[PDB]
Short mmCIF file of C-alpha atoms and ligand atoms in Angstrom, two decimals:
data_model
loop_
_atom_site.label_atom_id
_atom_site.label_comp_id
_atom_site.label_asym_id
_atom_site.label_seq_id
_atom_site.Cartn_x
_atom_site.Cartn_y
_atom_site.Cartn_z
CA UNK Y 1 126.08 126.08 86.22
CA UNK Y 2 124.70 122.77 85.50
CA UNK Y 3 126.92 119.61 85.72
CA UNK Y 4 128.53 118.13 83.30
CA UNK Y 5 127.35 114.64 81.58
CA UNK Y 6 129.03 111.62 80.50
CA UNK Y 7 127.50 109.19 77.75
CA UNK Y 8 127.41 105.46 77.56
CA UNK Y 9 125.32 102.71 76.41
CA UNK Y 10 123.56 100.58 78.81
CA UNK Y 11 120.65 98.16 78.32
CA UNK Y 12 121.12 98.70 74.86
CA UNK Y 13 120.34 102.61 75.13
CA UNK Y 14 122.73 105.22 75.62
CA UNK Y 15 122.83 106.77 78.76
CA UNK Y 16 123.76 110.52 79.69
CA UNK Y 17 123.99 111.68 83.52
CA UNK Y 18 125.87 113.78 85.37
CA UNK Y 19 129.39 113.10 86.85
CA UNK Y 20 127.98 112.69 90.60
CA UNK Y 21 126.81 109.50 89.39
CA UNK Y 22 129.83 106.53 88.78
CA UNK Y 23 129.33 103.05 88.45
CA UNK Y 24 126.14 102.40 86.89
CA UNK Y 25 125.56 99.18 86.41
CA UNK Y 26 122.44 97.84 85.18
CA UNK Y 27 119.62 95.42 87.31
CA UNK Y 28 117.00 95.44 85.51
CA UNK Y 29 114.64 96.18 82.14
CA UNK Y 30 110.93 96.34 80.60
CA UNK Y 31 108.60 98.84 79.14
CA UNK Y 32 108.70 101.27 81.61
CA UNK Y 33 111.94 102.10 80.81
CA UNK Y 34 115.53 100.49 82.12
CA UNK Y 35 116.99 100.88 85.28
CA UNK Y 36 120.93 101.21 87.18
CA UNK Y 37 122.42 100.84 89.88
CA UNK Y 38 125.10 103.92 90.72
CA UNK Y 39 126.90 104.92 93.35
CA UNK Y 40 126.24 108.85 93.96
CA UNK Y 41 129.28 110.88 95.26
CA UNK Y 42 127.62 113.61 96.36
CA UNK Y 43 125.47 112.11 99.05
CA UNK Y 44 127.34 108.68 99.09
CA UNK Y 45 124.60 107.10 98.49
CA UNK Y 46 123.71 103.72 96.81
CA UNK Y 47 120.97 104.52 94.34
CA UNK Y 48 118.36 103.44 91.50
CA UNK Y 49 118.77 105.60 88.10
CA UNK Y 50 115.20 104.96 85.67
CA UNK Y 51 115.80 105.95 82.42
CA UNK Y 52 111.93 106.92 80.91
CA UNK Y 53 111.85 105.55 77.20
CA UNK Y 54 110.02 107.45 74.68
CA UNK Y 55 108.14 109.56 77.33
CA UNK Y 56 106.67 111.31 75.36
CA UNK Y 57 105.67 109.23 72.30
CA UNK Y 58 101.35 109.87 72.51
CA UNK Y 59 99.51 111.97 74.32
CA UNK Y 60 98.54 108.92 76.97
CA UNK Y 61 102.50 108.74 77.51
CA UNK Y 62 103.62 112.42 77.56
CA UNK Y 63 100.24 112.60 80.50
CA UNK Y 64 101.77 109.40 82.42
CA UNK Y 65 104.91 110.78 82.43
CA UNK Y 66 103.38 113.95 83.61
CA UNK Y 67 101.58 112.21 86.19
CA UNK Y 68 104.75 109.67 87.53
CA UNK Y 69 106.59 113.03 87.64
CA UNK Y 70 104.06 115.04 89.85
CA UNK Y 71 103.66 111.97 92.65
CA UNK Y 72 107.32 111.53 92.66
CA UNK Y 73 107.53 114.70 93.76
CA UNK Y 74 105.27 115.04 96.14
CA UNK Y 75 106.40 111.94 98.18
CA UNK Y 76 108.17 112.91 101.10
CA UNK Y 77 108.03 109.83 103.64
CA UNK Y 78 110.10 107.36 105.25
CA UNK Y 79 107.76 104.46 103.90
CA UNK Y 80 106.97 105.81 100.51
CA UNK Y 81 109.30 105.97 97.53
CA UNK Y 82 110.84 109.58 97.71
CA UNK Y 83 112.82 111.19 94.65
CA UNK Y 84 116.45 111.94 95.33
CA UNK Y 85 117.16 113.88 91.80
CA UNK Y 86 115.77 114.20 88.29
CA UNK Y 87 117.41 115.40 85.30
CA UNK Y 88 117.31 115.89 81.71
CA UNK Y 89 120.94 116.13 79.44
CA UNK Y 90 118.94 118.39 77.41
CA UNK Y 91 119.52 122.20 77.97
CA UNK Y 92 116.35 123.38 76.07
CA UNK Y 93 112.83 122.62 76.13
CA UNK Y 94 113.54 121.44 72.33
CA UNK Y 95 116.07 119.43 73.46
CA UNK Y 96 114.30 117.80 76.01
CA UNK Y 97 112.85 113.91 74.81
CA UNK Y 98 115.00 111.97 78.20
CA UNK Y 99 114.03 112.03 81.54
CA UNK Y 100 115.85 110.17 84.26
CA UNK Y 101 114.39 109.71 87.77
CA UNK Y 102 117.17 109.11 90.59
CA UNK Y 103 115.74 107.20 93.84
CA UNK Y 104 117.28 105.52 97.09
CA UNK Y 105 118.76 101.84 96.31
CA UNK Y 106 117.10 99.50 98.24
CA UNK Y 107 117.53 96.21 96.92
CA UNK Y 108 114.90 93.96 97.38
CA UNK Y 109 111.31 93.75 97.33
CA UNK Y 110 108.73 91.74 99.94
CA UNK Y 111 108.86 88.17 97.74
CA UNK Y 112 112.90 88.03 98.29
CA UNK Y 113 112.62 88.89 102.30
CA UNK Y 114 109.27 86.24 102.66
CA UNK Y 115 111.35 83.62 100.70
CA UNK Y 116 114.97 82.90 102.61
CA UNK Y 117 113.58 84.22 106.29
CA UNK Y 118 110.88 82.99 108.60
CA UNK Y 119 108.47 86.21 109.53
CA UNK Y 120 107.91 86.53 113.15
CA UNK Y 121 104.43 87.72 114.41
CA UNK Y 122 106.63 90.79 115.58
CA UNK Y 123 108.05 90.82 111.62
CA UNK Y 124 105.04 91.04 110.12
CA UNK Y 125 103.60 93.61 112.69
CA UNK Y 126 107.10 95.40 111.98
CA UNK Y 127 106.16 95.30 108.12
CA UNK Y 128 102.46 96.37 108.27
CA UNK Y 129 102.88 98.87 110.18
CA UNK Y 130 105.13 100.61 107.59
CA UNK Y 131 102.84 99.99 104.77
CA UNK Y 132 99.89 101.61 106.51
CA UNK Y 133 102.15 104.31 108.17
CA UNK Y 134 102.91 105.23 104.18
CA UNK Y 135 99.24 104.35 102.94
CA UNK Y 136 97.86 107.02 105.74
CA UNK Y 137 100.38 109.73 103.92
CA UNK Y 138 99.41 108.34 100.40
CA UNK Y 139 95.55 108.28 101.61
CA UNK Y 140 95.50 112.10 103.23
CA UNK Y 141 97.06 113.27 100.44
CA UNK Y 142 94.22 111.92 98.35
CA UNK Y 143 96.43 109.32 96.58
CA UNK Y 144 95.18 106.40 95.71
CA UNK Y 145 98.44 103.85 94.97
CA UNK Y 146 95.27 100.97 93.22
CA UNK Y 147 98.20 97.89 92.98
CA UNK Y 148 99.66 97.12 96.45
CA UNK Y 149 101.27 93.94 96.04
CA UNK Y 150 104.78 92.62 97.66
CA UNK Y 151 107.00 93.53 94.73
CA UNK Y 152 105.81 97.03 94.84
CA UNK Y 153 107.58 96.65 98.65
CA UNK Y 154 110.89 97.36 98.80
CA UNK Y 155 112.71 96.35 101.58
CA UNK Y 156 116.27 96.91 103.23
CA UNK Y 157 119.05 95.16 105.61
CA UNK Y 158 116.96 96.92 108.37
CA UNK Y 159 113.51 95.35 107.29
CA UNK Y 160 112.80 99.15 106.64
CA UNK Y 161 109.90 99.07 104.28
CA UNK Y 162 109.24 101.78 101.64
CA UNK Y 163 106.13 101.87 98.65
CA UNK Y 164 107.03 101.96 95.06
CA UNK Y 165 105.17 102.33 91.63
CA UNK Y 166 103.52 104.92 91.67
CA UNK Y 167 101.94 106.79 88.35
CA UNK Y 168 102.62 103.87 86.21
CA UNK Y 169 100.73 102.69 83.22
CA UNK Y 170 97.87 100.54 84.10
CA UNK Y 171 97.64 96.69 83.21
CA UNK Y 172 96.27 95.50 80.39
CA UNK Y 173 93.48 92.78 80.12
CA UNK Y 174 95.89 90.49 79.12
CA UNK Y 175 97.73 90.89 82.20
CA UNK Y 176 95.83 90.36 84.78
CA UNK Y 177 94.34 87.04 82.83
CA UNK Y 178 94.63 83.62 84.66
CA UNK Y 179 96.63 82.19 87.15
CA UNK Y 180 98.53 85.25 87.82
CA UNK Y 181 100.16 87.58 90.69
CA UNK Y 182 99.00 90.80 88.94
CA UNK Y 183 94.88 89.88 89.87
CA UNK Y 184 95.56 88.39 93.42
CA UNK Y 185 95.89 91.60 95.57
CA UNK Y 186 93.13 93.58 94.23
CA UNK Y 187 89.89 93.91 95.85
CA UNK Y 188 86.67 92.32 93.96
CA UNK Y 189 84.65 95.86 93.65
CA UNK Y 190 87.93 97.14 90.67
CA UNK Y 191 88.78 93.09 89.72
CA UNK Y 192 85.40 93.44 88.40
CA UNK Y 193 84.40 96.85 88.28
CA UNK Y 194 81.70 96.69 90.27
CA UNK Y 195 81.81 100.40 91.53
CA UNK Y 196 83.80 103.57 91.34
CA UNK Y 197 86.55 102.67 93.49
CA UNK Y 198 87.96 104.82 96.53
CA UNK Y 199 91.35 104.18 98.38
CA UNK Y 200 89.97 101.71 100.78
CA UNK Y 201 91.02 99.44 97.85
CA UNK Y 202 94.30 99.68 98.76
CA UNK Y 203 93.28 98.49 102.25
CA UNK Y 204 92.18 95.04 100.75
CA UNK Y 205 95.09 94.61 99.04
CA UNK Y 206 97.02 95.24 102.55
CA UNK Y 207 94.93 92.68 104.57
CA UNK Y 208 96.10 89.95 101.24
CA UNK Y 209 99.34 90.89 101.91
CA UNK Y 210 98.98 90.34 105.52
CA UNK Y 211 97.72 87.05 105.40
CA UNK Y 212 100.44 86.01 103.25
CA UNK Y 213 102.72 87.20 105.69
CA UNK Y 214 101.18 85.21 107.77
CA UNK Y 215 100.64 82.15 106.74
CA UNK Y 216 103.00 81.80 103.71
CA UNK Y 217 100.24 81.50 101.26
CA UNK Y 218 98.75 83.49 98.43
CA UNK Y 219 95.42 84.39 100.15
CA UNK Y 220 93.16 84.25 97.01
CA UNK Y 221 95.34 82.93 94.28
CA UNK Y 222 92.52 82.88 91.91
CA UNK Y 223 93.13 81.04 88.12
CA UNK Y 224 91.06 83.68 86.48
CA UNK Y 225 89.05 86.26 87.88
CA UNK Y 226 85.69 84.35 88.34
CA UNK Y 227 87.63 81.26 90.08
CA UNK Y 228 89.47 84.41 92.41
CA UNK Y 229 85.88 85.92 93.05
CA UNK Y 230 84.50 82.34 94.59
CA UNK Y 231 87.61 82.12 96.94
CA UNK Y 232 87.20 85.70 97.91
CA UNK Y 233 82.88 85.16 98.62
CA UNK Y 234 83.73 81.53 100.34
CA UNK Y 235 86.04 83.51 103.01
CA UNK Y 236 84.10 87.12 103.37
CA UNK Y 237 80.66 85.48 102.20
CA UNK Y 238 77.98 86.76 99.34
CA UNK Y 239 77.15 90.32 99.52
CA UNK Y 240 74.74 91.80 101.24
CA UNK Y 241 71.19 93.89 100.07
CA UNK Y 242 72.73 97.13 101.07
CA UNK Y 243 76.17 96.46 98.64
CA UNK Y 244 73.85 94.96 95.97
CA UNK Y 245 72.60 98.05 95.65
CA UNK Y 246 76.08 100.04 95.29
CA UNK Y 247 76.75 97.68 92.37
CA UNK Y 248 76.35 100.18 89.16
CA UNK Y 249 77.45 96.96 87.21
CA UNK Y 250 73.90 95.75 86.64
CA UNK Y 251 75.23 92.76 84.74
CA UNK Y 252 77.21 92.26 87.88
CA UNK Y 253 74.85 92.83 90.38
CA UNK Y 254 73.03 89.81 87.76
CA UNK Y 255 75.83 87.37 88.39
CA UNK Y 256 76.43 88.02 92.17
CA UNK Y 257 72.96 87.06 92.78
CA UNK Y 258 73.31 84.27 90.81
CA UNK Y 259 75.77 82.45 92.90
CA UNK Y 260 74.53 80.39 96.24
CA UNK Y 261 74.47 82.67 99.43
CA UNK Y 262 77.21 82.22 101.71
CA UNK Y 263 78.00 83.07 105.22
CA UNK Y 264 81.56 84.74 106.56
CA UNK Y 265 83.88 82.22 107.38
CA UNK Y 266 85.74 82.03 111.45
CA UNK Y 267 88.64 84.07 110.75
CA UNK Y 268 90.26 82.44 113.83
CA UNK Y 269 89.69 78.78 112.15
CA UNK Y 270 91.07 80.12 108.75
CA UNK Y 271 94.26 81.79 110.78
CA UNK Y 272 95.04 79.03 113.41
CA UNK Y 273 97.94 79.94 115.75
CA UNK Y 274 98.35 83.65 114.48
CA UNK Y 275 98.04 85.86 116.94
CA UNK Y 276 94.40 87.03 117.99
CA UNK Y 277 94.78 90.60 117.25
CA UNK Y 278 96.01 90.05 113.61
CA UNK Y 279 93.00 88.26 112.68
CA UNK Y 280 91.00 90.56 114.32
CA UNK Y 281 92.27 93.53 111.88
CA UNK Y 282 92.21 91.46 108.76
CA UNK Y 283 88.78 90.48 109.47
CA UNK Y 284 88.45 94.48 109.72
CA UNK Y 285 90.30 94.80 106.68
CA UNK Y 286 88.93 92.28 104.27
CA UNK Y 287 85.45 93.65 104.30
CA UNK Y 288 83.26 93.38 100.88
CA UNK Y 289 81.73 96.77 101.26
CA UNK Y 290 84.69 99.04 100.51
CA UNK Y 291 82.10 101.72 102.75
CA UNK Y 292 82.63 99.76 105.77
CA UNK Y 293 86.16 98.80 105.60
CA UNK Y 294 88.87 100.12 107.76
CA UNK Y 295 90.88 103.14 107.08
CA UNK Y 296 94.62 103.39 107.15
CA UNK Y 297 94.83 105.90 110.15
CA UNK Y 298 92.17 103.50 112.24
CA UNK Y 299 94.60 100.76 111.70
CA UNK Y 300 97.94 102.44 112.90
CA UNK Y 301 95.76 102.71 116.39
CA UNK Y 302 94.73 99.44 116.27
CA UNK Y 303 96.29 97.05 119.38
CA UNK Y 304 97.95 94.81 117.20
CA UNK Y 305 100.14 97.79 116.44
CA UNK Y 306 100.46 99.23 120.04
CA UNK Y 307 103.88 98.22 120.21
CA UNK Y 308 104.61 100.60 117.05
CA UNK Y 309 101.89 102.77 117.62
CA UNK Y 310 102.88 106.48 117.58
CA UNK Y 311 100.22 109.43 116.55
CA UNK Y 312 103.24 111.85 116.63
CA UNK Y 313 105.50 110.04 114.72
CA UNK Y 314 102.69 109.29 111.88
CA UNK Y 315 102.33 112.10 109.22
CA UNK Y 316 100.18 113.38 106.59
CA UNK Y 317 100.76 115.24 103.09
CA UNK Y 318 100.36 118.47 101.93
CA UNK Y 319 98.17 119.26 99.76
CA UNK Y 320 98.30 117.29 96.08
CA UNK Y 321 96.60 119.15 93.25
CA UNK Y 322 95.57 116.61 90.77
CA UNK Y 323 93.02 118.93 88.39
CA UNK Y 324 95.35 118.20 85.44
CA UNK Y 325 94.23 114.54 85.71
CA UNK Y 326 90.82 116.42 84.16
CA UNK Y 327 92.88 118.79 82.03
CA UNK Y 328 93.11 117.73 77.97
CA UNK Y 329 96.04 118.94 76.67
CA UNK Y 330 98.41 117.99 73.73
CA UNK Y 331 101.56 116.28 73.55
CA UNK Y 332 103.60 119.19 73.26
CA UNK Y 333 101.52 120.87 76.10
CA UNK Y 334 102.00 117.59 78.78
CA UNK Y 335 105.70 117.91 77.84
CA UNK Y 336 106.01 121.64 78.50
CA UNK Y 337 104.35 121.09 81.87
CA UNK Y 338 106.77 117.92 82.81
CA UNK Y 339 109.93 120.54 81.19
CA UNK Y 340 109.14 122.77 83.99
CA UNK Y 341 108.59 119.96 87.04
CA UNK Y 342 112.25 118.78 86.35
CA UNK Y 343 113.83 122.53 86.44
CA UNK Y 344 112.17 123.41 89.53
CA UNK Y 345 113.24 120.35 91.21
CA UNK Y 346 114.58 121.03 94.60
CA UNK Y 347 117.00 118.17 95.74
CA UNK Y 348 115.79 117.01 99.25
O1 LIG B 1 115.76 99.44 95.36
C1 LIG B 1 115.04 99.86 94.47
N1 LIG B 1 114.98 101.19 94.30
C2 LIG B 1 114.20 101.90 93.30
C3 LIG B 1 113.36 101.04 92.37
C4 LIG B 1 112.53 101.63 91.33
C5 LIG B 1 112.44 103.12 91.09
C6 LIG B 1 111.30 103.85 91.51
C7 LIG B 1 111.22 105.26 91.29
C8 LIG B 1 112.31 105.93 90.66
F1 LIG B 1 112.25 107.25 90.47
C9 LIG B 1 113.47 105.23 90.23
C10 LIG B 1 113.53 103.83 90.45
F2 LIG B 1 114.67 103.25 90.00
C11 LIG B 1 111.75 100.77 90.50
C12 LIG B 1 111.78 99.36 90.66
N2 LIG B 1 111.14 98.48 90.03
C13 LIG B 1 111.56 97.97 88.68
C14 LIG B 1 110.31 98.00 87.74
N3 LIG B 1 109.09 97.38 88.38
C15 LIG B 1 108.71 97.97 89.69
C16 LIG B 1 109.89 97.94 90.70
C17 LIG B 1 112.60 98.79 91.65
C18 LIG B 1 113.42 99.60 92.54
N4 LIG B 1 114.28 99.04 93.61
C19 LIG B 1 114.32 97.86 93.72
C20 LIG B 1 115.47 97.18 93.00
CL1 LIG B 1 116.67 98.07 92.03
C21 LIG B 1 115.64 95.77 93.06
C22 LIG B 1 114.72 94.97 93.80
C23 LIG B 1 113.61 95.57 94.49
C24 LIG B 1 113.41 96.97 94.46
CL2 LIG B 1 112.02 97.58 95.31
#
């Protein structure tokens, strides 16, 4: 009893879906794959088709596949990206080579709002307060998202604010090289592998975004990552003995020691006019020692949020087994395993 599927070429590949969805138009391509725009008439919802290309083309693809898939999923939040339908045309596991993930339609992501509107001190609480109302669901579930930035923040009519990219294939050295949007939101201990990072890195990334919020200005808009370091040590100042020491990098832990000492800069001469309580949670936020930075649940209790502030009204995840990201398997074996993750799929 499975629907029945229409074909037609868009973005140059052809595209087979089920009859619910009419109207596909496309907005959008790269090398993740190609995405539409469709109108479903079964929910009557506006919505976001991706169409995975070559999913399954290497072992590293058929696992990252595997992996989108699985968080997908397991995402079932009002600020995270949650997955409305997934299908396959294919009607075998032989067959199966196309995978299509079906999401809510949302429009815009956090540079288009910051660009033709003038954020409030009551948007950007608003805003935050989403993210880290997602990132404490992401965090409990053990998820680590590792690329906050503003165009992984989608963002409706409403101003209701929900986190995207999840599972996809890491950046290359090439880009996050220079002058560049890609480096700007990460925190120094992964820019420069310094450490096994945790999920407080996603924290960092937050208080960058704040800031920007803010004050309308890349915090740390580094040309390469050495320039982006110096701007990051002049505001937070050099590390510490006890950090030195969490350094594995030794060549690392060589160059920070290198560079002059430097004290932490007044946060409320850096911020002038913002509102007292945001710069006291980004100075909480933009700590160098990952150990000692703020959590996403100690934020959403944090005054500058009271207004939002909710502890019944801010959920956690189940459970989200993640062995297989420790499993070795082959191609064939990755794909078998995402097969069965789109049949059991249970719309929402
Ligand atoms: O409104 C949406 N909805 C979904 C959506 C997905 C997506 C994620 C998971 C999935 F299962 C299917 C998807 F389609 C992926 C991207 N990117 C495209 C590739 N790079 C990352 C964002 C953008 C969007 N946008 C979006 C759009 Cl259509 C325009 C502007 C801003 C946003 Cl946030």
């Amino acid at each position: 009893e499975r629907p029945t599927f229409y074909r037609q070429e868009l973005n140059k590949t052809i595209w087979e879906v089920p009859e619910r969805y009419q109207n596909l138009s496309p907005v959008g391509s790269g090398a993740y794959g190609s995405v539409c725009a469709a109108f479903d008439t079964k929910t009557g919802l506006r919505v976001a088709v991706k169409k995975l290309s070559r999913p399954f083309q290497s072992i590293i693809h058929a696992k990252r596949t595997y992996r989108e898939l699985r968080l997908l999923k397991h995402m079932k939040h009002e600020n995270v990206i949650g997955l409305l339908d997934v299908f396959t045309p294919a009607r075998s596991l032989e067959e199966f080579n196309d995978v299509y993930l079906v999401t809510h339609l949302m429009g815009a992501d956090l540079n288009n709002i910051v660009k033709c509107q003038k954020l409030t001190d009551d948007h950007v609480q608003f805003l935050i307060y989403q993210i880290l109302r997602g990132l404490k669901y992401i965090h409990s579930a053990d998820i680590i998202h590792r690329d906050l930035k503003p165009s992984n923040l989608a963002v409706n009519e409403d101003c209701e604010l929900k986190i995207l990219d999840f599972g996809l294939a890491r950046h290359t050295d090439d880009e996050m090289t220079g002058y560049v949007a890609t480096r700007w939101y990460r925190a120094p201990e992964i820019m420069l592998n310094w450490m096994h990072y945790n999920q407080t890195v996603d924290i960092w990334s937050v208080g960058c975004i704040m800031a920007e919020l803010l004050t309308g200005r890349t915090l740390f808009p580094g040309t390469d990552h050495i320039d982006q370091l110096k701007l990051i040590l002049r505001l937070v100042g050099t590390p510490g003995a006890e950090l030195l020491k969490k350094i594995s990098s030794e060549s690392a832990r060589n160059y920070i020691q290198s560079l002059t000492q430097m004290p932490k800069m007044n946060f409320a001469n850096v911020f002038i006019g913002a509102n007292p309580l945001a710069v006291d949670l980004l100075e909480k936020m933009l700590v160098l020692d990952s150990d000692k930075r703020i959590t996403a649940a100690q934020a959403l209790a944090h005054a500058y949020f009271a207004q939002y502030h909710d502890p019944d009204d801010e959920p956690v995840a189940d459970p989200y087994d993640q062995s297989f990201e420790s499993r070795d398997l082959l191609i064939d074996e990755w794909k078998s395993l995402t097969y069965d993750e789109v049949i059991s799929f249970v719309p929402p």
